């Protein structure tokens, strides 16, 4: 029962070189190099699904701050204002509203200003 | 009307024929030959016969009018390496590859 | 041809030591 390996080994290597398309030099041509590149791609990919959720919130916060200060209040007080007014609109939605409807956002600044005074 | 001619197994490395191949790519065939005639390279001799072979392919088989042809494609590929041995010092033997090349030249009236 | 096969090749092997040079040396 002699087993020749050529057919199975090609299929296994081809899967890897396929995952490595777009990489530079040997990393998209040479199995040994590609294999290390594809794993590391996976390592980073896992990690940055966690990181992605961090980066977006920092962006929303940063934008609300600018728009809050435009209506004459700091981020820290505006959020506190909304909490004591029991407004629960999150920062994804608030940063969206900060950009596309400045008049609705100003109305949320008053809502949060009334509660805070 | 693409027309091909080739010198296969030319006795020159692909690298060396390429410097000369590059001089005539995209040119009128009349203009190309003059360039080749006064290029001081062994490789000028090899490809020129091929271009002229290609010119004759164009007249005799179909195409014709020497005026209308341009060197629309030209590429030089690697031929077989002949394996040989050179004695060096202290009983050590080195490989020499006597490299060859596949010279392809394409011409068309359009 | 065009036999194309002159070479054996039977490539030679050198041995063993021409140079033993130091040193650390002790």
């Amino acid at each position: 029962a002699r087993v020749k390996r050529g057919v199975i080994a090609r299929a296994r290597h081809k899967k890897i070189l396929k995952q490595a398309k777009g990489y530079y030099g040997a990393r998209s041509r040479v199995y040994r190099v590609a294999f290390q590149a594809v794993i590391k791609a996976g390592q980073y990919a896992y990690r940055d699904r966690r990181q992605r959720k961090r980066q977006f919130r920092q962006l929303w916060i940063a934008r609300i701050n600018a728009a809050a200060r435009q209506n004459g209040i700091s981020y820290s007080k505006f959020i506190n204002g909304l909490k004591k007014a029991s407004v629960e609109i999150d920062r994804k939605i608030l940063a969206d509203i900060a950009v596309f409807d400045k008049v609705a956002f100003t109305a949320l600044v008053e809502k949060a200003k009334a509660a805070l005074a | 009307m693409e027309t091909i001619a080739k010198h296969r197994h030319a006795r020159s490395s692909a690298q060396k024929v390429r410097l000369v191949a590059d001089l005539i790519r995209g040119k009128k065939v009349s203009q190309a030959l003059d360039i080749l005639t006064y290029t001081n390279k062994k490789a000028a001799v090899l490809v020129k016969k091929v271009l002229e072979s290609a010119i004759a392919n164009a007249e005799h088989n179909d195409g014709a009018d020497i005026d209308d042809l341009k060197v629309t494609k030209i590429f030089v590929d690697e031929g077989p390496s002949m394996k040989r041995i050179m004695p060096r010092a202290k009983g050590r033997a080195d490989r020499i590859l006597k490299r060859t090349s596949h010279i392809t030249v394409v011409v068309s009236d359009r | 041809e065009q036999k194309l096969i002159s070479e054996e090749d039977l490539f030679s092997t050198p041995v063993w030591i021409s140079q033993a040079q130091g040193i650390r040396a002790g």
Binding site: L59, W60, R63, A66, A67, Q70, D96, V99 | - | -
Partner: protein, 142 residues
């Protein structure tokens, strides 16, 4: 859906004059740095330049507290042998007063291609005017 993003082939970037007279050095360079980044625009976007163009006259008249006028030292190397050259704040004002405001903001701006691109929009003069009168800059108390 996805979040807004500034597009460099749409963004507006406005023009401002700022008087640096009597202003504390790096306590003003902060607001320039901040504004050259567009941190004050709700449409702020960290990879895009949504900042504004800022003229700064009377850089020779910017203030520093305590003994910094004489003791504060600027070092630079020339990539040579000894290299380490030296000069005080007062000496910088003397030689080229523009440099003090420039070096301040530069070190507060993000470092990198875009970083170096925001700096380009800072237009510091020593004198009390500029050639950018056609740019119709509006006065800024910063």
């Amino acid at each position: 859906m996805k979040t807004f993003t500034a597009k460099p082939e749409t963004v507006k970037r406005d023009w401002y004059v700022v008087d640096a007279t009597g202003k504390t050095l790096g306590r003003l360079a902060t607001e320039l740095a901040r504004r050259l980044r567009g941190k004050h625009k709700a449409e702020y976007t960290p990879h895009v330049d949504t900042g504004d163009y800022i003229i700064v006259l009377n850089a020779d008249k910017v203030a520093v507290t305590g003994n910094k006028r004489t003791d504060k030292v600027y070092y630079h190397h020339t990539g040579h042998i000894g290299g380490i050259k030296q000069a005080t704040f007062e000496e910088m004002i003397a030689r080229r007063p523009e440099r003090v405001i420039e070096i301040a903001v530069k070190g507060m701006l993000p470092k990198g291609p875009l970083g170096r691109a925001m700096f380009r929009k800072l237009k510091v003069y020593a004198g009390n005017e500029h050639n950018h009168a056609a740019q119709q800059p509006q006065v800024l108390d910063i």
